[PDB]
Amino acid sequence: HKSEVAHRFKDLGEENFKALVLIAFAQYLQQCPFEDHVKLVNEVTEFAKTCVADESAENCDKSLHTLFGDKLCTVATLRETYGEMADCCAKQEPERNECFLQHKDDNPNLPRLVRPEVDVMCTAFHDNEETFLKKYLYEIARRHPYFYAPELLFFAKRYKAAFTECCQAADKAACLLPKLDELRDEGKASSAKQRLKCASLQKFGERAFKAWAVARLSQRFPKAEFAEVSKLVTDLTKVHTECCHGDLLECADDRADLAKYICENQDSISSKLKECCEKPLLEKSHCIAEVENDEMPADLPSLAADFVESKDVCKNYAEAKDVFLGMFLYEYARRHPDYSVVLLLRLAKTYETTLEKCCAAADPHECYAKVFDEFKPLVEEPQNLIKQNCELFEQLGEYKFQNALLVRYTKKVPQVSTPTLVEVSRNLGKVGSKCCKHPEAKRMPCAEDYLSVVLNQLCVLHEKTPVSDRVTKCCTESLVNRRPCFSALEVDETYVPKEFNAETFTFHADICTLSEKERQIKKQTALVELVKHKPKATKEQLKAVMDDFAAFVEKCCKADDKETCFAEEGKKLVAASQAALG
Numbered sequence: 001h002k003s004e005v006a007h008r009f010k011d012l013g014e015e016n017f018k019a020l021v022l023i024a025f026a027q028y029l030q031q032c033p034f035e036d037h038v039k040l041v042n043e044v045t046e047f048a049k050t051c052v053a054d055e056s057a058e059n060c061d062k063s064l065h066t067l068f069g070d071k072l073c074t075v076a077t078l079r080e081t082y083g084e085m086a087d088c089c090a091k092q093e094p095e096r097n098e099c100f101l102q103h104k105d106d107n108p109n110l111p112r113l114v115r116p117e118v119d120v121m122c123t124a125f126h127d128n129e130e131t132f133l134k135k136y137l138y139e140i141a142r143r144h145p146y147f148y149a150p151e152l153l154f155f156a157k158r159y160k161a162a163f164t165e166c167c168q169a170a171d172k173a174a175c176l177l178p179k180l181d182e183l184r185d186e187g188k189a190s191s192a193k194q195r196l197k198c199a200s201l202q203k204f205g206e207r208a209f210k211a212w213a214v215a216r217l218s219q220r221f222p223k224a225e226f227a228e229v230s231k232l233v234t235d236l237t238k239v240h241t242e243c244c245h246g247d248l249l250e251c252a253d254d255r256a257d258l259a260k261y262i263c264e265n266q267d268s269i270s271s272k273l274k275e276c277c278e279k280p281l282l283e284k285s286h287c288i289a290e291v292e293n294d295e296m297p298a299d300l301p302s303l304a305a306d307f308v309e310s311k312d313v314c315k316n317y318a319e320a321k322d323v324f325l326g327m328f329l330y331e332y333a334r335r336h337p338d339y340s341v342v343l344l345l346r347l348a349k350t351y352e353t354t355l356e357k358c359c360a361a362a363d364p365h366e367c368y369a370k371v372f373d374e375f376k377p378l379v380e381e382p383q384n385l386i387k388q389n390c391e392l393f394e395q396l397g398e399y400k401f402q403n404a405l406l407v408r409y410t411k412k413v414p415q416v417s418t419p420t421l422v423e424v425s426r427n428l429g430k431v432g433s434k435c436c437k438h439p440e441a442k443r444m445p446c447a448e449d450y451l452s453v454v455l456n457q458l459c460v461l462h463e464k465t466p467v468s469d470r471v472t473k474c475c476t477e478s479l480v481n482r483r484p485c486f487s488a489l490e491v492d493e494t495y496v497p498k499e500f501n502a503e504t505f506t507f508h509a510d511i512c513t514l515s516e517k518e519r520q521i522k523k524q525t526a527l528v529e530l531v532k533h534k535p536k537a538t539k540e541q542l543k544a545v546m547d548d549f550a551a552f553v554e555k556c557c558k559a560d561d562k563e564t565c566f567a568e569e570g571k572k573l574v575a576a577s578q579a580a581l582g
């Protein structure tokens, strides 16, 4: 059209427009103060209205990158504040934009945002709803420069709904606090995946991404033809590359096009898409990527027909290897919404290895006739891990379950730092209560989704401060062997127990006054240290001590006097325990 700005403004709306411009600026100029960005939003919004009124008004012809880049080069303190970035302004548009992206610090040194008290938040919320939500939106976006703007916006609205609903509530805190905690994990989760997918695209390459995509798309759109899914995988790939490069605009448009396409061919893709395709521009993509799995045909053949029994397997495979394998995945994935994507990838890989060995042999058909029997243990391994662990989780609670993981993993890798072992086990415990409440058919997909960010995140830490070659092995293994590699870690026999330190096992009454989350962490921290000191202790000896510790706490908190109790009894405990563990 004549004017891009006019257009976006029109089919986005002033409110969303202002919010997005704010986010965009906050993401590039992470150092400027809030009031400075607000001024810019106003100036750009005014500009936009001018173009809405006259498509032919001065500058309205300009493109968004050009417009955006100019206003950016407006900042006076630019060179004094961002040094090198200012040199970008000396370049022509294409390079200019490109130059800005390269100076977008993916993780600056800003203070960690602290959460104020419910009352202050609620009061601030009512006194000026807008600047309240905008300032935080500003704080969050400058700290997460690669977070897709429209999604950052979707979160903000949920946050607003929570304040509306809770700042009116009798027990404000009992209402809000838990809603905020949940919103945070989801936001941190969303953020981690975002970074995760792009890192993956980098390491593993396009081939691996396409495969991951085929499987994923097929589980969701089981009724679509392979031609459609191929078309989608291709476009989805252009979209991820684009979106990972960091260019918001190009990223947003590619996502827009892909959504409208899907919505138009909605009949040849899925039936669970009606709701999503009825929503406004800003939310279509988001809705679609979240859509529920559509139901499969029921009148579907057996894979063995076309992939095992049918002579020609090799002729068709040699004709177009990745395509044939893509077909295998499509076929296998859409009949199994219950498998994690990586499991599907492991089957496809096993099948590829086989076709490679068999198609170059005397009698093909007989060499690969029993390939499906190889899939069995591959499918059963993950299945049994879920079952065993979910059963254990039902017996104990999220808490006692977290302590079980603590003992278990401290033993595998004692070298690991205590605060890290506690962080990880608690998150694992969360995943436990999150996914174990689903029925078997949805358990594996669930665990995969959560376990992937947890696994990825723990690998980076170790990347920063390696402690074990074993972990490094698993962390640099193939995307398909990662989890299995970690599952295979057995007890570290080499390890030498930490020498006893009386301080580590000393407790004062300050634990009677502490809160749940605090008491637990302190108990769990002591637990890891206990195992690091006596790694050969049985699950029995250990439970014994833990039980003695159970009383100790009580027989000292609910006591006529703390301090003393924790000093007299405390000495007794260490002595007893020390003895019962050689």
Ligand SMILES: CCCCC/C=C\C/C=C\C/C=C\C/C=C\CCCC(=O)O
Pocket: 113, 115, 132, 133, 136, 137, 140, 152, 155, 156, 159, 180, 181, 183, 184, 185, 186, 187, 188, 191
């Ligand atoms: C850090 C999570 C990242 C996801 C957040 C995404 C969007 C939020 C942006 C604006 C919401 C406005 C106000 C939120 C209020 C408090 C946030 C403190 C974070 C926490 O609850 O401790």
Ligand SMILES: CCCCC/C=C\C/C=C\C/C=C\C/C=C\CCCC(=O)O
Pocket: 207, 208, 210, 211, 214, 230, 233, 234, 322, 323, 325, 326, 345, 348, 349, 352, 478
């Ligand atoms: C341009 C048309 C493309 C459509 C076909 C779609 C996907 C084909 C590409 C790959 C799928 C084939 C096998 C996957 C097997 C193992 C995972 C790859 C991981 C790796 O590499 O270790």
Ligand SMILES: CCCCC/C=C\C/C=C\C/C=C\C/C=C\CCCC(=O)O
Pocket: 005, 008, 012, 020, 021, 024, 044, 064, 067, 068, 071, 150, 248, 249, 252, 253, 255, 256, 259, 281, 282, 283, 284, 285, 286
């Ligand atoms: C004069 C300065 C111009 C800079 C303006 C900066 C940002 C506003 C421009 C576009 C807004 C970005 C995305 C919105 C477009 C489509 C909906 C999201 C696509 C999707 O995911 O479905």
Ligand SMILES: CCCCC/C=C\C/C=C\C/C=C\C/C=C\CCCC(=O)O
Pocket: 340, 342, 343, 382, 383, 385, 386, 389, 390, 405, 428, 429, 431, 432, 435, 436, 443, 444, 446, 447, 448, 451, 483, 484
């Ligand atoms: C839903 C189970 C949540 C419990 C998780 C708690 C602790 C972790 C311990 C074991 C891991 C359990 C299951 C992992 C199996 C499959 C995950 C999908 C990835 C893959 O196919 O490799």
Ligand SMILES: CCCCC/C=C\C/C=C\C/C=C\C/C=C\CCCC(=O)O
Pocket: 385, 409, 412, 413, 416, 420, 421, 424, 428, 451, 455, 458, 459, 461, 462, 463, 465, 467, 471, 483, 486, 487, 488, 489
């Ligand atoms: C700096 C990071 C150091 C790594 C230490 C962190 C955790 C302990 C070691 C390995 C990973 C343990 C659990 C991760 C979650 C699921 C995979 C294991 C599945 C299983 O149990 O079958």
Ligand SMILES: CCCCC/C=C\C/C=C\C/C=C\C/C=C\CCCC(=O)O
Pocket: 403, 505, 523, 524, 526, 527, 530, 533, 534, 545, 546, 549, 550, 573, 574, 577, 578, 579, 581
């Ligand atoms: C030779 C070393 C002996 C030192 C023994 C001294 C103190 C015990 C050490 C650690 C504490 C042990 C268990 C507490 C942690 C979790 C159990 C849950 C308790 C509960 O809430 O139910």
